[PDB]
Amino acid sequence: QPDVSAVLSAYNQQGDPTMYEEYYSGLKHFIECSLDCHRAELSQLFYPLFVHMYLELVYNQHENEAKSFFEKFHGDQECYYQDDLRVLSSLTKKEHMKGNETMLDFRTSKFVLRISRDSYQLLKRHLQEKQNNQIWNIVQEHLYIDIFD
Ligand SMILES: [Ca+2]
């Protein structure tokens, strides 16, 4: 397991923080409008992407944006993540993350994700529609994700 500082290194490369809600809303609509088979697989992305993006906003001192992002998307996460989310919501400032062992519980790389190539194809295409979609960067650099036939 990585140390705290290694975990926090994951939240360095921020995107345009004013667009995070747009990116996540875009993904949500894309996933919800997919065929059942693709939607079932891709729905796995929701929680880890939400946690990473929120912490990215907080870590880069976009406190307003983080609060707003959390308020908009925490509600539709799986019911069994809502206890983890209450704890996540107490982390509102960069100060709260630094030197904090609880960050181990939210490390993006602990969420194992497996999807079909078909689903990946389609996801990749959606995420390349908008220029420098930050979710595409998180998928490339931080998600523990494998694709299969
Ligand atoms: Ca839980």
Please report, as a single letter, which amino acid is at residue 30: F
User: Ligand 1 centroid to 129 CA: how many Å?
Assistant: 33
User: Ligand 1 centroid to 111 CA: how many Å?
Assistant: 13
Cα–Cα nearest to 86, from 51, 57, 113: 51
Cα–Cα nearest to 64, from 93, 40, 41, 39: 93
Please report, as a single letter, which amino acid is at residue 34: S
User: Ligand 1 centroid to 28 CA: how many Å?
Assistant: 21
100 vs 14: CA distance, rounded Å: 20
User: Domain 1-149 - what CATH class?
Assistant: mainly alpha
Which experimental method was this entry solved with?
A: X-ray
Resolution in A: 2.2
User: Ligand 1 centroid to 80 CA: how many Å?
Assistant: 5
Domain map (residue ranges) of the chain:
1-149
